[model samples]
Target: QPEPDMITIFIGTWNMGNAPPPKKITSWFLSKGQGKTRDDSADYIPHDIYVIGTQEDPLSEKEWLEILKHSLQEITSVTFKTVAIHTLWNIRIVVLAKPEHENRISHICTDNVKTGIANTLGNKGAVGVSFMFNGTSLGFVNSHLTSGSEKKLRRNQNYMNILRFLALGDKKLSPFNITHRFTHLFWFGDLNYRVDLPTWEAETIIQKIKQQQYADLLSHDQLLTERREQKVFLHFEEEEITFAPTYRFERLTRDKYAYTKQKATGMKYNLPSWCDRVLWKSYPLVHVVCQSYGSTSDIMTSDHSPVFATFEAGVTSQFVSKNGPGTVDSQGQIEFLRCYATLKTKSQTKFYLEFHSSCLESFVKSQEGENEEGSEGELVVKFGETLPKLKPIISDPEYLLDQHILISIKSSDSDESYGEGCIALRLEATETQLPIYTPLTHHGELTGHFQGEIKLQTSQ
Candidate 1:
């Protein structure tokens, strides 16, 4: 049987203004009186499917829930999840809406431990969310690092904290082994650092940390071409005609009263910075095929333009059994004999024999005794009086390739330590030898016990 092809994931980020007021705040805000009314009133508002932002005014968890509910109506065939990091005046949240194939979604809000002190104000914060789809998992982290000269180290501290969160925090730590499949991870947000500038003198710390595991999506040469060709200006303009500088400041302007009022106040807004970006794990199954680094036109909806990307998830290939066309009797016998003869040869005998021996050894051990450790205690292996009906989920293929096999192991125990046991095995057959290959097998001892309660299931 052939493995499933690529899964497409669409991700976008936006900053929505805080929930409007006139209603009091409380934890159960999403359920009660005026809050419900306010929430109902917001039903018509169109929010970014995924919103990440600050100054969610008239702040209340309930209002965010209302905003979330409204946002959900616009998205179909997906479930939404959010993680919020709050400050006295600002709240940063990330909303994730998964398509049908995705299973469970995990949410984790990073501890804003570095807040209050001069070195951590306004610049330090982090939040993370993870998704498990088909058989693979990936994490999304959104953060707002500090800006300005008030205390640059605070920005640096915020930057370092995010790295620690991704690398050491309890949420989605790296090198994770889940049923033998490695976790595919990513961390993205408004890092506040510019890549074009020299690293040493740069005001923000994002670029320095980009040196670590993440690949900045916006910095890709092809994406830059899109930005240029699309005329996607990141900065904003004043009077709808003049471009403002990056930093906002007040300057002298002609007064309406001329000599009477020496100077009149005028406003200036700069072009948006293409600062926001996405980053991802550099893996065989993961590829960033398209991206948009928000243009000035996108600002009509929010302060920072939303950034989006389309990613291809997972690797797949066709498999065929060496047996003859349609019928297994003649084809199976011929292929089996050929494989057996190959196993008897000088060049292939040792390899084939060792493979079968290992498989047989593991199979026998599983039947010999019950696993006894943390949860499931020692017991005799149960023997079946008769063979149970068998059905194929993964159909038999005509031929097998080196990549045909995927192996994983897990315990029936509930504890985290017991959960550590798992593995995956891959076949490395080349195209030239694929047609001649027969049955492929793997052998490995179960690191943990199988409890009766653990139900097994499979899907394509």
Candidate 2:
């Protein structure tokens, strides 16, 4: 029988630069190639949760998930299913858990940080999710922080940026003291820290790495320097990195330390260091064992290789508060991330709309025009007595609120990607249900309140 009070987690990360995946996906990111029988193969070990962080990945998402879904079903007797997935521009993250344990996952919240030029662009940053597992709080952040050794402090800045990105007085979550909020925090990504040695010296260390001398190289890693000197990750801990550097490799080739690609600003004779990594930390009474930490060199699609870490954490229930509609907590909360509407321009009806916010979760669940040909969309707001019984047109009951989020909606007739969605709100009363609200003003734009919580301004 499994340990009654413990759970194992497997986390992995890579920056694909939007490249398409290969023909066979099984064991591609883990355990070398598809046919490898290494001790770390999927058969050798099994975990309860799997998290993957990808930068510049897209069509690759479906490909990976398809293979993972099939592979999980074949993992002896356990069944795994993707509980949640999110994307912020080029950064994508997904969480999978065993079927029986999936429902234990709750409070799925997300926040992102953009440390790009003026911190407005998605060129560089991290996407984070905080959740509770069997009353044990855990936070997972997949970051592609600012690159280059010269602009190093910005990588450190990305950590703090994610912190401020999530801290909100209006939002309700089980609280913790920074790193302690969640009993454990796992942050993985292309951290972009260089070696403290010169180009020639780094390659020399790489040669030693071939001889299993990973210690010497890790000792000079800039990330470790920031940890002791700058306290970047605060109380985060990392299992020893026993593999060679994961960045600056030759694209479309076998796994090797030397790479044959990259912009002049990045490579330019720079000593390749471990750019991709997985680090974790925990608070008092939380036991997180680092089973393994290493990089995979089997796949050569991206310039950066995938890094993974396995950990088993003990469950610890902590003091946590709640948020969302109750008595008076819904006042400052934003109703929906994206509110969909087919606005009329006096001449005709337009079919596209995208809302932008800082961190709120937004999506157009469904949209439909009036069945009577020429009529514009007549919006109906459905209100539920409690959040559980509510049907949110934009966000799920546990979707993010208060944090800025952008939502995009479009007619099925006019979109390459968008689809039909609906607009509804929650009624914070104790009644069983309320009448469907028809909030339509014939002239043009949407301007009004219907439910106890009205929709926020849409970015469209």
Candidate 3:
């Protein structure tokens, strides 16, 4: 019942300095918070997981957390739980997980990077968190890199230092280095790597972009430029920048990417950049696909616009079908439980069937009932929505593929006492998904009780 065909996750990053957000924060967490939003997924399926990173404002961190909590309750279900953490100072990151998935997500670890002040304080740096979901491990880092185009090298070193200094407190852990330990990784924040062009030069590129030549400007993006040079964030994947630049938004300007917002003491004080972003890396058994990456211009509380991403992760789950797709009661009644297990297609599927429901109705039904355990009963099974639960049994992840229910049967039986009566080798589907259980159908008395195991394999 837990594992669905697919699931959705949402990630966001914002920089608010010391200013509080607007009272109405539709674009704060979920993409589709407002009635009509540009950065949300195509459908209205609420995100099952959320990883949010925020920078600036120490005294307001609690209020920000409370606001996010309230926002989640207003937009999604209460079944979701959150864990919020901060680094050296105001650098904060939070993770939200559904209650049902809590058990599957364990081994949580976190660390922080203080790139400011001797690389020991967190005035401007990063905070990272790691966890294991299902059978895969993942990492998320929210960083604030060195500012200015001249400090691009410093920005790369900041990432390298963060990678080197970042680690959990406990020893003998899942490894501090995220690149080698995680099956999937997502990094985002106010990276602060400026455009290579000068303010007026970037303004010209912006003019060309407004004229529909957007690709030309992104080509000169400093982050992409450094990544190509193998300076930092080597294997991380940045999706095509279709949305407008997400930084330097100002209260005085109607046009985005205008020179209204400026950073003092910086050479290109007013050159807008895509400073806030989301990038990812994935290994086998998991694949990350970017659907939507954009920013919200509705809220203008901060000079920087909030950036968000909507991505789908295809993952493999264990336990496909347990018992039949149906169920039976505790007292051998027709009431049964729906059983399912994981299936890794391209994997070797195996099943073991040992039926022990040997009972002659405990009564003399027919002259053939002379034998103590001789009764005619039927076994029930279901595979998928249409496929039957019965099939060839190679027996890898499943001793028996699906659950087997018996109507007329014996109750005095234990797992240890149940002998291998006979393993169903070749199976044929029936007109009504019924398993043949007539007495003397073949060798011994027809017993239609079995425990099923199903295995589905994926690239690890």
Candidate 4:
């Protein structure tokens, strides 16, 4: 029997408060807990993947990206690529991976959800990136939830909304929930949940940080308290925090919590909170062990110290069928196919797809009306139900594309057709074709369109 493979990943989160990339912030990427040894095989060495999420980042996407590229590249001799990055205004999340792992990574998708004022602005929300790493699905979410010591309930609502709407696939097709569908999922950033204690009590604990007196403060941590009481973050797991609070540090200073008066309220210092954090959950079969958890205290460009965690994630090595949709086991056992498309209408009217699996030569001779009982997929609605997983079929790209698949966009209330189209396969020279949207016609006139990213999918 084949054994599971283990890969290391490092995740860091910070609320930059709109600060630009510091001149030498490489320490933020390096493991502070793993001490000076940088051997390739050492537990402290760089990880296979690095995910950094930031909130209140005012820099342009180009500038922000260049900073990460420069920082990681200059620090290590090994090469890395920024595979995925998404931004929702001040909230930005970037994923970087080792060059060797790139080939096995596929179906990279990103999306964002707004939980800001009126749930319409980008001031507070989450940005996520989801992808297939070898045969495993991984999701990373960077979020900025509602902030305020008293806004605990609001923060909970923000968490639920982000989990509910921050999806990572085609919206018109199956937009898999970031938390549910991934084999491993990480949520990090300026979560903004404060300590359920008085500002004075929090400041008192901050003074005792040198003694590592974090237990009392941590016991009152809003995020943990909520999680403990079953108020939010149901099954998510966080590494036992050994570091002190990471929020409200004095900007431009070192190792000092921000203790200032509010300009309007004349109040004392804000509660020193662990607003920046990293949390993760994974499928039971895929094991995850946290090797280190702490925050970078030296990089004080922002009020929030950057928090990081390193993990060794173990996933079984399965054969991802490059020739077709879905995967095959090491013994070459057939896995199900995940074939889907993304269709868009002019208005809020919904749509669906009715198709049958067939190759070109036979389909060309037969009339469209002959296929009486064809398989049906969805564009929207009833996404939570178990979709039928068709068995893996033939793997001929040319013949597969030539197969006849019909699209029927019907009204939400009735099955009456709003538009219809016949699938036309577009050939490409590369290993895979770029996803292209094909036009749909209503009574012989072009009316709507849908992206034909119809690839074989397996329900893992």
What's the TM-score of every candidate structure?
A: 0.41, 0.62, 0.63, 0.67
TM-score, ranked from best to worst: 4, 3, 2, 1
Better of 2 and 3 by lDDT: 2
Q: Which candidate is the best by lDDT?
A: 4
Off by over 4 Å in 4: 1-4, 33-44, 119-122, 169-176, 264-269, 318-460
Query: What Cα-based lDDT does every candidate model obtain?
Result: 0.30, 0.56, 0.55, 0.64
Give a tens-digit lDDT track for model 2, residues 1-460: 3323688887878888567655544453344521111354455355778888888785555776776677656654556778667677788788888777766778777776676565446577777777777546678888888776666787777766665465411243211123434557888887888877765575577677567676777777889988877457755688766666777776786445553225854545546678878888664334678866766656677777777777889763221225322222232333332222333322223343333321223322333322222244543222222221112223323222212222233344645212211123233321223332222221111222222234432111
In model 1, what lDDT does residue 241 have?
10
Instruction: lDDT winner between 3 and 4, please give it.
Output: 4
Q: What is the Cα-based TM-score of model 2?
A: 0.62
For model 1, residues 113-221, the per-residue Cα lDDT tens digits are 2333564355346555444433344455555556432333454455444544332222232222211222344444554442233324332323322342123323422
Look at candidate 4 and tell me the lDDT of residue 188. Answer: 88
What's model 3's overall lDDT?
A: 0.55
By summed lDDT, the worst window of 10 consecutive residues in model 4 runs over 362-371
Cα lDDT of model 4 by residue, 122-150, tens digit: 48889999887765678899989887788
Kindly report the root-mean-square deviation of model 1 from the true structure over all alpha carbons. Answer: 17.3
lDDT tens string, model 3, 53-143? Answer: 8776444556766777677777764546764455557777888876777776777888887785665353778898887666455678899
